Amino acid sequence: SEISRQEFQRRRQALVEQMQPGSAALIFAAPEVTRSADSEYPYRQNSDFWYFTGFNEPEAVLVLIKSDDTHNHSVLFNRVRDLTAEIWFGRRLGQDAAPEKLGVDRALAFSEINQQLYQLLNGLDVVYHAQGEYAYADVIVNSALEKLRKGSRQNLTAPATMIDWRPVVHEMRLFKSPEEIAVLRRAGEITAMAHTRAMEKCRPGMFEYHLEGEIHHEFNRHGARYPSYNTIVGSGENGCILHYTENECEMRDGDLVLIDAGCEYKGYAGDITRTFPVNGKFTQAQREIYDIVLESLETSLRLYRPGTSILEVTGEVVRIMVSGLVKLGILKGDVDELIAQNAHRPFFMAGLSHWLGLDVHDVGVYGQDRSRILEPGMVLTVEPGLYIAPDAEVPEQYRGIGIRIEDDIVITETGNENLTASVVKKPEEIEALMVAARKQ
Amino acid sequence: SEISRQEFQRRRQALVEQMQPGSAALIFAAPEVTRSADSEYPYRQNSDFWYFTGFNEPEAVLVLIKSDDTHNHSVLFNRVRDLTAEIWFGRRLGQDAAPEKLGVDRALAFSEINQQLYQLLNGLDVVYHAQGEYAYADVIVNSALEKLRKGSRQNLTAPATMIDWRPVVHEMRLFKSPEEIAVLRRAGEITAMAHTRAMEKCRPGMFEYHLEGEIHHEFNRHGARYPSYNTIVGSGENGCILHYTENECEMRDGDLVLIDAGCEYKGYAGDITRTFPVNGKFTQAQREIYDIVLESLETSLRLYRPGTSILEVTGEVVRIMVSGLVKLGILKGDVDELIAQNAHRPFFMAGLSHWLGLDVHDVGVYGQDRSRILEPGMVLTVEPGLYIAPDAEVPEQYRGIGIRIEDDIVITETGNENLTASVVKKPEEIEALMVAARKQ
């Protein structure tokens, strides 16, 4: 699926609706980013700028002007067309095609922005700007306001009020539209197919990075060229490290592998984690920890719905985990006292959920301790895990284990929808899948 | 293959040999680099810092101190160990293991660099620093020199002389050692296998990005996780655009596809371009242009040797190209006058060769118009191409064609060695390869 022109227009108007009359909102594009020397990383548009434009060029600025409660218009600054620059550094939209292509009223050359922007802000009361987001943007905005401030003899005046649009825009991004949900739904499928494939390909002797290659290939073949985040393939003791991206080790018969990978599809992130035996057969000890993480996920998926919160559901997960660990002798004592002592923390130190959207760790206000009441349209991850360090003082068989199972959900009128359930997580279903693949 | 500890030591001493007595060289690591929000691109170490250390962390600084012509020592600043930071943002070397792991004399915490660096520079005559390379580095170095300058009452003195080490270091990087050549030799094989695979997989109806996925998979499976540069898959008229990386189009029966992709293997870049029919069968018109580019490459590979230069060989290529284009009626007139008129330029506007190494467009001095005499150990690309715009005023059958064929070579005592010849480029061999694959 995709995001429509009409949808981009709706979002702009939605922002304008909340703006004060006599104001302008300034949204800047991301800079290009060096990888080494004259070589650059693949371009990634700023998420907020993308959200309002679906325009994948740098050196661009969207300006939304609200004259009053019924009058408003849009100006885009963007790079000019140029036969030289394009033949080299690749084709450009230019000013002519931009109004029609991107549904803006006017389009001006970025190279003129210092000559033109102050004229657009002259006489307004308010400017909305995300200060500190980019250095080049702050320089342009501050330069425009100084010309207005020092220009009373030329009848110029600066807006005295600057407001951060991020709280407003991020509150919008927090609630996904039907179109957005459809896109994320497809990101979930693509990402899941990748994890299914990783499970099917995995053999002892393969290196962790080989599963990374299989996943990225799968993303690509469905049209999601880039991952939403750096892929994790943590086998054995590497599963205990949360930001493990080296993915440099041989995968050994007997170990578990934790794979956290997500595609980026039309800008929107998938985010799945599956953990499984490298040899296709869970051991007793591996099952004992896996079952606790899986019950945490399965209960959380039953619970998540409008009315509850991440905090509340996290409470139930803590309970499930402390009980499970007490039964294994990894913790000793009363469950309720241990909870109050937060005794689960050496083993479960991540949160259960984060917002998901144009960024994998998406924008939006969580509330104190993530107490915010959930409403339909919110999209989030459910990702319980247990991480027992190699030197943890616990029975030997649990040492050096890292297990996480992560699914992506959307809150609905009566519950939630699981976007990533098409890749399996029940242990019998994992072993069946891997067995089935190993006859080929 | 790999780069040894001993080799890293040799390079450091080689630099020290050329430094003035009573001097210190400051080499800084690359900053981490944001992709979107809290998510980061895969880390890419600065090439020069990497060259002297094989150390893949940010917030690190190599300091090489020359007391005199026989006394010198090395200090490394690097991130301290930290159970918190690592469990999250991934394992760190720390100060204890660093001397032995990386062959430096001393290792100090990066968080102490402002308290310690000025003490290392006190009383020296010369500091070698690459000014403007990184903002954070300039701030550290300038801060260290100001403390020394303003500290005469505490018997401190700053070195009065600052020298850019880049000309010196880049002249070293220009000449590859046996180990480096072995690594690049393997980068060439990996990259070539990827291009062979792309040719074998290509069918009409596949999208350009599908061949990108096949190539990146092949890089990965041989242990080259990342490309050295953003992959180009330019089919049809997209072949006319030199920085085409969108790779977003359906590949059509009848069109050519130009694939320029390279792996990064132990830091060193492969760089191959092959152009071929999407349907496995060159047309007369496609053959007519391809044959001119291929003769240019084949002649260049015969010519490149110690004693000649990129400029001189480029001269012979211009000749080959103008003659070929005159025979097709794409140019009219006397070959020699047309050459003097530079009449080939609308169609051949890139250079023939660039240095290759830790950067795809490698460091090192070219000489005026690339006139520098070649010597053994230099590594470079040979990449003639013809690009006929869709609206070029030439016979219709040549319009909208882009063809490049690129190989990587090293200059040897008596000629050159072709690192990328294991992927085919003779047209009959391309058609045979694709035919053979199409029975499967």
Added chain:
Amino acid sequence: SEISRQEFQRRRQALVEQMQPGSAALIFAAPEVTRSADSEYPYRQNSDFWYFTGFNEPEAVLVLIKSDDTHNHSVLFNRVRDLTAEIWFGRRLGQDAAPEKLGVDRALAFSEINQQLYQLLNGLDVVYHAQGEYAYADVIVNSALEKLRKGSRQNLTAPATMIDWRPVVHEMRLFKSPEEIAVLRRAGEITAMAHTRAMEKCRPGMFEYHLEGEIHHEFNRHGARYPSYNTIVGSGENGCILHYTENECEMRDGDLVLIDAGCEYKGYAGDITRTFPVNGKFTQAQREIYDIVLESLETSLRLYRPGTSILEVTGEVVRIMVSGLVKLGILKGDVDELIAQNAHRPFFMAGLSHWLGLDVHDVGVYGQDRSRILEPGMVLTVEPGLYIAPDAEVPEQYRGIGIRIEDDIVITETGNENLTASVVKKPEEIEALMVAARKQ
């Protein structure tokens, strides 16, 4: 006279009255300023910071917090006491004496401002800050807002709204209180005594700078140590240059001298200009131009009152000047057409009036073309002048003449009060004064 503690408190409350509830206003002190090497200029406090504090130290910040419509409090950041620093760079107020001395609620060390300021802004909706006023201030404020923005997990939130307090504060400064008027009244007397003295001392053969010395001495002896602006003593052709401060020439019998000097008394600027014959006797040609400037000033002093504007009075001055110049043959033609042609501009190119206060060119909004209706409490200069260039195409006797006569006034309920009329300006009174002095 002086400014009371109570008055400083009133101004703070007056600002607070206009602030939004749940807001904080940040007012920064001026940096110290190098003259050459380790030597500094005499310290000049930022005028706005001074206005609210009467505190003459750098590295100080006034923070006014409005909790709601009845609750507000003040925090001062200032330099800590230190026996070392003071014995050297001079005594300091410190935190203990500050609340009581300066009428603030709380006082904290400036060296703690980055550890404390963000805590004062946490949870507010609005911060009032003068962006771009000082680099060090912007760094402190931006640093405080980033900690709040990135600190949601520690339950911090930044104010989303930033407002420039300068329009508000400068509108306050535009209207002087009884105390302020009394201070300016005394600045006027001091400044005038200085000009009277200059006239009495002036002889041919003295250098322009000698009159500067006489003026600065007079300022000093009445307790106004520093001038409000760099003194102008433009004799002969130097009178034609508006920013003449070299004051390096011998004063010649036959020439006029234009003296523009003002004291700074308790922070408030005097600003007087008197022009007079170096030899104490006006010539016919000097009188002819002087009489036009003086009638302009005398008419302006009759006119200035509540209800009119600088623009309107400037209109009447233009009329007076064009008529005067036509009668001398310096302009030819119809007065009304010449006015419309703005034909007076080569000779009268300054404005007639500027606001006067803590800055000689004081803050406050003028309106388009200075059309703002005057109200009681506004303080301003009246300074018509004629400047005929040495090469002006006019009768020889008028070439190379510069004449200005400037007085300071305050608008009152029924007119204006002249603060500087105690130094003479009628030509007969100037000649009498100089004659009287020349018998001594």
Added chain:
Amino acid sequence: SEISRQEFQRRRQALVEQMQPGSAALIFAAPEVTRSADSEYPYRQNSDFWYFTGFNEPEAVLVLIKSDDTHNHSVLFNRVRDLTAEIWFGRRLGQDAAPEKLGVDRALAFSEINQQLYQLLNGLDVVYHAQGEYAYADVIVNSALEKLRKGSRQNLTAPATMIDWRPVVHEMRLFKSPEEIAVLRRAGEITAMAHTRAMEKCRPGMFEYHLEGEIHHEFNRHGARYPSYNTIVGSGENGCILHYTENECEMRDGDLVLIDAGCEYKGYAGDITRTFPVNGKFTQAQREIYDIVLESLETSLRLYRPGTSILEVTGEVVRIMVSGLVKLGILKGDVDELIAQNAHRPFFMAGLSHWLGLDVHDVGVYGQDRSRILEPGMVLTVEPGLYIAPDAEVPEQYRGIGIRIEDDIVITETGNENLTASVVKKPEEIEALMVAARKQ
């Protein structure tokens, strides 16, 4: 006296003599400096730039180019002429008159410096630049070097070596020429006349600032418009504060007043301190401390000559002071042990001497603990003092006293010459002077 054109040329050549062949030296002018709002401090040229040019404008850059050991030339960047700018912000030299006026070969507009400077540095090996001296200069120089670095395809190359010219230039400034000595000799006379006048004018009831006014007037009347540093008039307990510049107190019968004031004459600083009874009659206790400071000064003036050092002479002063204080009972014990205990430090905590020149605290290397052997041509202050705090644990009669006596000297072939001896310092001569004045 003054500094000649020829002398400015000599200094430039002297610098060039020491420069490497194939190099350029970049010397920048001082920025203009705000006092409050649109008002500026009196302009003070950077001392080093002044030293080579005698040119008193901002936005100017001297560039000295050494082609080889016999070829060199000078380029000046300066502000262009402009009838508008000058009529307002005052006359300018421009490019036409500059070569001849200031003895440079070529002169270009400052507004072109970014278009022209890199062309002057292209192909040189060395650039001499004072990094960190001014922000605007670093921006210009770094911008010029980046164009050269990134411009190999346009056959540009940057100098790889940057050297600080300050050690070289400051070593030149350390040794004064005959002309410089003549100028300083006159600065000494002017400054001394000012101090004599202060002594003659001083009466109880006058404020400290009144003596400041008398001194500044005297400076001015001899053509030294500005002081070299902020004047100190510390009466009573204010004498104990070294950086006392408030000068705000009533001078009381019975107290001493310490006056430290210096003129700036043709750029060169005078620096004299005299301390004397406000009522013209020293008391026993005042005499007891004064006599120790005066013997320190008189012995130092006998001692200072080529061959000795500030450190060595400071040794003899410490001896004189500890003995004097022991005889008064302000210190108890063995003189030699007390010296070794540095027991004099609570009372004598300043140094004895600093270099004097274009800056009051002049440039030049002191050596460790100021051990540098003195040579003819060095100019320095001799300024012993005793400062007994109001709460010092000493006999009551010595509490709250500050006494310093400072003279300026030049080292000669056989000793020194005292530039400031024309103002008196023997106590009987002070009392005679004040008595004589008090009959008038």
